[PDB]
C-alpha cells in the first residue's frame, strides 16, 4: 500500500491578492452544494448516454461530451470526440424545389 | 557492430565532453554496452567527476552507480573514493546519507 | 445636437456618394409624459439613422423590429444592473454608520457599465473618435473613387 | 383513441416523484445468455446513498468519495461495470473550472478595480447571471438562507 | 394555420390576435430542429466523431430523441410541481419564531442603512 | 479618462442620437428616476455603441458573401450569423 | 398517426429541411406528441399572464413573458401593426 | 580596409514609345516566352549583360538582372534593337530605375538582440512572421535585413548612392553590437 | 509535438515533459480543426468548395489581423519591447537558438505531415493550398506563445555541504494544471460583451484562441 482540505483554499487563494476572504456558514456552503448538484446531474446524464450506446457497460467519454455540449466546459485532454458533420442543409431534390417555388411566389408568382 | 567503430564512437564522445541531453543519451546507451570496451568507457566516467557538480548529473549519477557494480578493482576503488570524501567525516551524517538521500537506482540483484 | 448632427452629416455624405456610385455603375455598364408606441417608433428612427453601413431602412421590416426589441432588452439590462447594485442590502455597499461608503456613488456606475458590455470608460472616447474617423475615411475612399471615375469617363 | 400504445406512460405527479425517489436495482434476466461477466448488485446503491457527500464537510470531494457515489448512480440507472478511475479526475477538473467561473463573477461584482465577500453579493450575481447554475434544488435553498 | 385555431379551441381562448400562430409555429420549428440535431449527434456517438475514423449513417430511433429532449428539460420547461422540496425547505424556514413585539401603532421600518431614502441619485 | 466624460455630456457638444425623452421613458420603465442628465445620456451612449457593433458585424458578414475583391439588403442570413456570433440565439424561421 | 400536427409532412418538412432522410415514422409520431404538449404548456402559462391583465384577447406579450419564465429563449420580431397575409 | 556594398540587382523600366505587336515579335525572336491564358507580354533575354526583359504591348518594358546602372542602360539599349530592326518605332526613352538591391558582409557576428531592443523604433523580429531580424531607415527610405553572420541586405533604393549612404550610416551601429 | 516544445521554448520557458506537450498538441489540433470547420461551412454557404484566405482572416476578425497580414506579405508594445531588451545577450549561442524556433514552424516545409496529422478527411472533393498551411502555422505559433504567457503568469501569481549529485541545473515550472487554468482564462467566455444577455437561462457556444 502507500505511506499515508487544501483544495478549496487553493481554489480561492489563487483567484485574488487583495484578501477577499469568503465566509463559511453563508457562502462556502452554497458552493459545496452547487458542486454536489453538478456531479449528480452530470454522472446521471452520462450513464444514460452510455446505456444509449446499446452496450451495458461502463461510462467513459460520455462525460466529456455531456460537458462540451450542455454546459460550456471543454476539456482539452483525454477523449477526442467532435461532430465530424457540417450538417448540410439540402437532402435530395424536392426541398430546394419548394425553396425556388416559394421564391418565385415571393418575387412574381 | 565491431569494437573499432565503437572505439571511434567512444573517442568521438570523448572529444564532445571537452546538446547536453544529447550527450546523456549517448553515454546512457554506452552503459548498455557493458553487457574491454567498457574498461575504456568507465575510464571516461571517472575523469568526468574529476574535472567538474554544476554539470547536469542526469547521465552521471546513474552511471556512477553502475560503475561500482561492474567488478573491476582499479575503478571501483577510484569511484567509491570520490563519493566517500564528499560526505562529512562523522558516522551520523554518513548514516543519514545512505537512506534519507542518495536514492538507490538498482532494483536488481546487487 | 452635435452627435445627431455628425451622424446626419454621415447620412448626407452617404446619400450623395452612394447616389454617385450608382449612377457611375449605370454609366460604366452603359457601354413630458410619453407612451409606448411613440417610444418604439422613435427608437426605430434612431436605429435606422445609425445604419450608415447598409442603407437607412434599406432592409426587411422584421429586422427592424428585431433590432428595436434587442436594444430595448439591452437598455433594460443596464438599468436592472445599476438599481440592483444601489439596493444591495449588503455590507460591501450600504452607507456605513460613520458615513463610510466602501465604494462611493461613482464606482457603482463604472461597475454596472463593466458588468454589461463596455469594459472601461475610455472605450467610449475611442468609439467616438472611431465614428468621426469612419466619416472621413469612407468620405475619402468614395471621393477618390469619384475622382478616378471622373477621370475614367473621359 | 388514446395514444401511447404501450404498457403505459403515466402523466401524474406523485408517482413520478416516488419512482424518482426510491433507489432502483438493475437486476437482470437470463433467457439464453446475458453477458457482462460481473453479476449486478444493489449493495452498491446503498453504499452510494450513505457517503458523507459535500456541504457537510468543508472541502470539494477527493476521488474516492466521488467514485463511491458514482457506482451507486450507475447501478441505480441500469448500467453495470466499474467506473475506471479516469472519469473522476476529468469530473473534478470540470468542477473546479465551474467554481472558479462563479467566484470570478462575484469578484467582478464587489470591487471595480481590502474587501471581504458576503452571501448577498453571490445572490446578486446569481440574479444577473443565472445561466451559470441549473435551476432547482439550490436556488430555492438559496432564497431560504438569507 | 387553421389547425392551430383548432388547437386553440381546446382551451376556450377564441380571442387571438393572429400573430400567435406564426410565432408558436416558428417556435416549434426552432425547438424540433435543435432536438433532432443533437439526437443525430448521439446517433453518431453510438456509431463508433473524430478527424476521420468511420462513416455517418442515420437511423434516429426514439431513444436518441428522448436523450436530446431530456437534456433540454434539464434546464428548461417548468417541471412537475416540486412539492416535497418546497415542503421541507419551508419547514426549515418555518422554524424560528416570530419577533413577538409591539411597534405601537405605526409602521416599523428597517433601520436606515437598510432603507433606501429615495433621493435624487447624484455623484 | 473618466471625469472628462461627465465634463462633456452636459453641454450640447455631445448629445446622443437617442433622444432624452425616449431614454427617460426607458429609465422609468425599468425603474430609475434622477434629476441628473449625464447618466441618462451615458446609457444612451453605451447602447448606441453596442448597436454600432452589431452594425459592423453585419457590414463585414455581408461583405464576405460574394465578390470579395438592386442595392444592399441586411437579410436574415446576415442577421442569423451576427446575432448568433453574439449570445443572441438561433433564428430558424420557416414557411408552410 | 397518434394526434394532431400530422407528422407525415410537418415533422417531415422539419427533418428534410435539416438535411436528413432516415426518420422512422413512429419517431415523428412521438415528436408530434412532444411539440403538441409543449404548445399546451406555453399556452397555459400565457393564459396565467392573460387573466392577471384581466383581459381576454391574448396578445404576444403574454407568450413572450411565458417564454421568459420557462427559462427558454425569447422570440423577437413580431409587431402588432403591419398585419398578416 | 574597405567594406562596401555590391549591387545585386537593378530592376529598371523603360518605354519604347510605340505600340508593339507582341505575337509577331515573339515569333521572330523565337526564343521568347510568349504564352496564352496568362501574362500578356513577351519575356526576352540576353547572354550578357545577362538580363531578363518583360516587354509589354503598351510600348513599355521592364528589364531585370543588371548589377549596375550602366549595364542596365546598356541592356535597355540592346532590347530596343531586337524590336526596332523588326521595323518598329522602338524609341528608347524615359529610362527609370524601379529598385536597387545590394548586399554587404561586415565579417563579424552581430548581437542583433541588443540592436533590436535598443533600436526597436526601426528594428523588428517576429519569429512566426519572418526569419531573421530587420531595420527600416527613414532617410533614406531603405529596408536593411541584418543577419547574425554579419551579412546584410539593403533594399528599396531607387538610386545607387543611397545604398552606400544607408550602409555608411548603419555600420557604426553594427560595430557597437559586434559579438566577440 | 517537438515543434510545439521548440515553440514553447521560443515564447519564454524551458523543460516541458511529454505530458504538457502532448496536451498542447491536442489543444492546437482542436483549435485548428474548429477553424477549418467554420471556414469551410461559410464558403459552402457562399457556394464554393475551395478554402480561401479572405474567410479565415475575417474568421479571426480582431486585432488578430495586423500580425497575420504581415506574415502573408512577407511570404502594450513597450512591454514586448522591454522584455526583449532584458533578453539581449550572447554565448553558448544565445541569440542563435531564438532563430531556430522562428524557422522550424510546420509551414517551413513539412507542410505535408502538418496537413495529414490534423484533420484531412473533411472536404474530400477539394483540397486546400499551401498558403493556408503557412497561415495555420502562424496561428498555431501565436496560440502556443499566448498559452505559455498565461501559464507563466499564473505560475508567478501563485508565488550544509552539497552532496554533488543534485546538479543544480533542473527546474519544474510548467504542467497540466497551469495550462488548464490558462486555457480557462483565455476562454474568457466572450469579451462578455457577447454574453450581455444577462438575465435569462440556458447557454452554449464554441470559441477559439
UniProtKB/TrEMBL annotation, chain B:
Belongs to the PI3/PI4-kinase family. TRA1 subfamily. This is Transcription-associated protein. It comes from Komagataella phaffii (strain GS115 / ATCC 20864) (Yeast). The chain holds residues 2346 to 2468 of 3825 of the full protein.
UniProtKB/TrEMBL annotation, chain D:
Coiled coil: none annotated. Transmembrane segments: none annotated. It is found in: Nucleus. It comes from the Eukaryota. This is Transcriptional coactivator HFI1/ADA1. It comes from Komagataella phaffii (strain GS115 / ATCC 20864) (Yeast).
From TrEMBL, chain F:
Signal peptide: none annotated. It is found in: Nucleus. Belongs to the TAF10 family. Functions as a component of both the DNA-binding general transcription initiation factor complex TFIID and the transcription coactivator SAGA complex. Binding of TFIID to a promoter (with or without TATA element) is the initial step in pre-initiation complex (PIC) formation. This is Transcription initiation factor TFIID subunit 10. It comes from Komagataella phaffii (strain GS115 / ATCC 20864). The chain holds residues 58 to 216 of 217 of the full protein.
UniProtKB/TrEMBL annotation, chain G:
The chain holds residues 13 to 97 of 485 of the full protein. Belongs to the TAF6 family. It comes from Komagataella phaffii (strain GS115 / ATCC 20864) (Yeast). This is TBP-associated factor 6. It is found in: Nucleus. The lineage of its organism: Eukaryota, Fungi, Dikarya, Ascomycota, Saccharomycotina. Residues 4-68 form the TATA box binding protein associated factor (TAF) histone-like fold domain.
Amino acid at each position: 500500500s502507500q505511506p499515508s482540505l487544501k483544495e478549496l483554499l487553493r481554489n480561492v487563494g489563487a483567484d485574488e491578492g487583495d484578501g477577499e476572504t469568503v465566509i463559511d456558514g453563508d457562502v462556502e456552503e452554497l458552493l459545496l452544494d452547487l458542486a454536489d448538484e453538478f456531479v449528480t446531474s452530470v454522472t446521471s446524464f452520462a450513464c444514460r448516454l452510455a446505456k444509449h450506446r446499446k452496450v451495458d457497460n461502463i461510462d467513459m467519454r460520455d462525460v466529456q461530451l455531456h460537458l462540451e455540449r450542455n454546459w460550456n466546459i471543454r476539456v482539452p485532454g483525454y477523449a477526442s470526440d467532435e461532430i465530424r458533420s457540417v450538417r448540410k442543409f439540402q437532402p435530395t431534390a424536392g426541398y430546394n424545389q419548394k425553396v425556388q417555388g416559394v421564391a418565385i411566389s415571393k418575387s412574381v408568382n | 557492430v565491431d569494437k573499432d567503430m565503437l572505439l571511434k564512437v567512444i573517442n568521438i564522445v570523448t572529444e564532445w565532453i571537452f546538446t547536453t541531453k544529447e550527450k546523456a543519451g549517448i553515454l546512457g546507451k554506452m552503459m548498455i554496452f557493458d553487457l574491454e570496451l567498457s574498461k575504456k568507457f568507465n575510464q571516461v566516467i571517472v575523469d568526468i567527476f574529476e574535472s567538474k557538480h554544476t554539470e547536469l548529473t542526469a547521465r552521471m549519477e546513474t552511471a556512477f552507480l553502475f560503475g561500482t557494480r561492474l567488478s573491476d578493482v582499479s575503478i571501483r576503488k577510484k569511484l567509491m573514493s570520490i563519493l566517500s570524501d564528499s560526505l562529512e567525516l562523522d558516522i551520523d551524517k554518513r548514516l543519514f546519507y545512505i537512506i534519507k538521500d542518495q536514492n538507490w537506482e538498482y532494483l536488481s540483484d546487487y | 445636437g452635435m452627435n445627431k448632427k455628425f451622424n446626419e452629416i454621415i447620412h448626407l455624405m452617404q446619400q450623395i456618394r452612394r447616389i454617385c456610385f450608382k449612377i457611375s455603375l449605370i454609366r460604366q455598364m452603359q457601354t413630458d409624459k410619453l407612451d409606448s408606441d411613440v417610444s418604439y417608433n422613435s427608437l426605430k428612427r434612431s436605429i435606422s439613422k445609425i445604419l450608415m453601413a447598409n442603407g437607412f431602412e434599406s432592409t426587411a421590416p422584421f429586422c427592424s423590429d428585431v433590432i428595436t426589441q434587442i436594444a430595448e432588452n439591452y437598455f433594460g439590462n443596464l438599468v436592472k444592473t445599476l438599481k440592483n447594485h444601489i439596493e444591495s442590502k449588503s455590507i460591501n455597499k450600504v452607507m456605513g454608520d460613520a458615513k463610510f461608503q466602501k465604494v462611493s456613488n461613482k464606482d457603482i456606475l463604472l461597475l454596472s457599465l463593466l458588468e454589461n458590455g463596455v469594459e472601461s470608460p475610455d472605450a467610449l472616447y475611442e468609439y467616438y473618435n472611431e465614428n468621426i474617423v469612419k466619416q472621413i475615411s469612407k468620405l475619402e475612399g468614395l471621393k477618390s473613387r469619384l475622382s478616378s471615375f471622373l477621370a475614367e469617363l473621359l | 383513441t388514446r395514444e401511447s400504445g404501450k404498457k403505459g406512460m403515466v402523466n401524474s405527479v406523485i408517482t413520478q416523484t416516488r419512482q424518482a425517489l426510491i433507489p432502483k436495482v438493475p437486476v437482470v434476466t437470463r433467457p439464453t445468455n446475458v453477458p457482462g461477466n460481473s453479476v449486478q448488485w444493489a449493495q452498491d446503491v446503498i453504499h452510494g446513498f450513505q457517503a458523507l457527500l459535500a456541504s457537510e464537510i468543508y472541502e470539494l470531494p477527493e476521488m474516492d468519495n466521488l467514485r463511491t457515489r458514482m457506482t451507486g448512480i450507475s447501478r441505480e440507472h441500469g448500467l453495470i461495470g466499474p467506473v475506471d478511475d479516469s472519469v473522476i479526475e476529468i469530473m473534478l477538473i470540470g468542477l473546479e473550472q465551474h467554481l472558479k467561473g462563479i467566484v470570478e463573477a462575484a469578484i467582478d461584482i464587489v470591487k471595480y478595480r481590502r474587501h471581504t465577500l458576503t452571501i448577498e453579493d453571490m445572490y446578486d450575481t446569481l440574479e444577473q447571471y443565472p445561466y451559470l447554475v441549473e435551476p432547482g434544488g439550490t436556488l430555492l435553498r438559496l432564497q431560504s438562507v438569507m | 394555420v387553421r389547425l392551430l385555431h383548432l388547437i386553440f379551441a381546446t382551451q376556450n381562448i377564441y380571442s387571438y390576435q393572429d400573430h400567435v400562430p406564426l410565432q408558436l409555429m416558428d417556435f416549434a420549428y426552432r425547438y424540433t430542429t435543435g432536438t433532432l440535431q443533437d439526437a443525430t449527434i448521439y446517433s453518431d456517438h453510438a456509431h463508433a466523431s473524430n478527424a476521420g475514423n468511420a462513416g455517418t449513417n442515420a437511423q434516429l430511433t426514439t431513444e436518441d430523441i428522448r436523450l436530446a429532449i431530456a437534456a433540454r428539460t434539464n434546464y428548461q420547461f417548468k417541471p412537475v410541481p416540486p412539492k416535497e422540496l418546497l415542503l421541507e425547505l419551508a419547514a426549515e424556514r418555518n422554524k424560528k419564531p416570530l419577533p413577538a413585539v409591539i411597534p405601537t401603532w405605526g409602521i416599523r421600518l428597517p433601520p436606515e442603512k437598510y432603507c433606501l431614502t429615495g433621493k435624487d441619485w447624484v455623484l | 479618462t473618466l471625469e472628462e466624460i461627465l465634463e462633456m455630456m452636459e453641454d450640447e457638444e455631445f448629445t446622443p442620437i437617442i433622444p432624452d425623452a425616449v431614454t427617460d421613458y426607458y429609465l422609468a420603465k425599468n425603474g430609475f428616476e434622477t434629476s441628473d442628465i449625464k447618466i441618462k445620456r451615458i446609457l444612451a451612449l453605451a447602447t448606441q455603441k453596442f448597436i454600432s457593433d452589431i452594425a459592423q458585424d453585419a457590414y463585414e458578414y455581408s461583405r464576405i458573401r460574394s465578390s470579395s475583391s438592386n442595392k444592399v439588403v441586411l437579410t436574415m442570413d446576415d442577421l442569423r450569423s451576427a446575432l448568433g456570433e453574439y449570445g443572441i440565439n438561433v433564428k430558424r424561421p420557416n414557411f408552410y | 398517426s397518434h394526434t394532431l400536427w400530422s407528422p407525415s409532412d410537418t415533422v417531415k418538412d422539419a427533418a428534410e429541411s435539416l438535411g436528413i432522410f432516415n426518420l422512422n415514422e413512429e419517431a415523428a409520431k412521438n415528436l408530434a406528441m412532444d411539440i403538441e404538449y409543449r404548445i399546451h404548456e406555453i399556452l397555459d402559462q400565457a393564459s396565467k399572464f392573460m387573466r392577471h391583465g384581466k383581459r381576454r384577447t391574448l396578445h404576444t406579450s403574454d407568450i413572450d413573458r411565458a417564454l421568459k419564465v420557462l427559462n427558454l429563449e425569447p422570440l423577437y420580431g413580431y409587431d402588432v401593426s403591419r398585419p398578416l397575409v | 580596409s574597405g567594406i562596401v556594398p555590391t549591387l545585386q540587382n537593378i530592376v529598371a523600366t523603360v518605354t519604347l514609345g510605340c505600340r508593339l505587336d507582341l505575337k509577331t515579335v515573339a515569333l521572330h525572336a523565337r526564343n521568347a516566352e510568349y504564352n496564352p491564358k496568362r501574362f500578356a507580354a513577351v519575356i526576352m533575354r540576353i547572354r550578357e549583360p545577362k538580363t531578363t526583359a518583360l516587354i509589354f504591348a503598351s510600348g513599355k518594358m521592364v528589364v531585370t538582372g543588371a548589377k549596375s546602372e550602366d549595364d542596365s542602360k546598356l541592356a535597355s539599349r540592346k532590347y530596343a534593337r531586337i524590336i526596332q530592326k523588326i521595323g518598329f518605332a522602338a524609341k528608347f526613352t524615359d529610362f527609370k530605375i524601379q529598385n536597387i538591391v545590394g548586399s554587404c558582409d561586415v565579417k563579424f557576428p552581430i548581437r542583433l538582440e541588443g540592436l533590436a531592443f535598443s533600436h526597436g523604433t526601426f528594428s523588428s523580429y517576429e519569429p512566426e512572421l519572418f526569419p531573421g531580424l530587420i531595420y527600416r531607415m527613414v532617410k533614406p527610405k531603405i529596408v536593411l535585413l541584418i543577419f547574425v553572420s554579419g551579412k546584410i541586405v539593403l533594399t528599396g533604393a531607387k538610386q545607387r548612392e543611397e545604398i552606400y549612404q544607408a550602409f555608411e550610416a548603419i555600420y557604426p551601429v553594427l560595430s557597437e553590437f559586434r559579438k566577440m | 509535438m517537438e515543434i510545439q516544445q521548440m515553440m514553447f521554448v521560443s515564447g519564454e520557458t524551458n523543460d516541458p515533459p511529454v505530458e504538457t506537450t502532448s496536451l498542447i498538441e491536442d489543444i492546437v489540433r482542436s483549435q485548428v480543426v474548429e477553424i477549418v470547420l467554420h471556414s469551410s461551412q461559410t464558403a459552402l454557404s457562399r457556394g464554393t468548395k475551395s478554402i480561401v484566405p479572405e474567410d479565415v482572416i475575417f474568421l479571426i476578425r480582431h486585432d488578430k489581423a495586423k500580425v497575420n497580414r504581415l506574415r502573408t506579405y512577407l511570404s502594450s508594445l513597450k512591454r514586448l519591447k522591454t522584455n526583449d531588451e532584458r533578453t539581449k545577450n550572447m554565448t553558448k549561442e544565445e541569440y542563435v537558438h531564438w532563430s531556430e524556433c522562428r524557422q522550424a514552424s510546420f509551414t517551413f516545409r513539412k507542410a505535408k505531415r502538418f496537413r495529414e496529422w490534423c484533420g484531412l478527411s473533411h472536404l474530400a472533393e477539394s483540397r486546400p493550398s499551401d498558403d493556408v498551411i503557412d497561415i495555420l502555422g502562424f496561428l498555431t505559433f501565436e496560440m502556443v506563445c499566448s498559452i505559455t504567457e498565461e501559464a507563466l503568469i499564473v505560475k508567478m501569481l501563485e508565488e550544509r555541504k552539497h552532496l554533488f549529485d543534485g546538479p543544480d541545473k533542473d527546474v519544474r515550472p510548467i504542467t497540466s494544471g497551469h495550462v488548464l487554468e490558462a486555457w480557462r482564462r483565455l476562454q474568457k467566455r466572450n469579451v462578455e460583451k457577447k454574453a450581455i444577455r444577462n438575465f435569462q437561462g440556458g447557454k452554449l457556444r464554441s470559441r477559439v484562441q
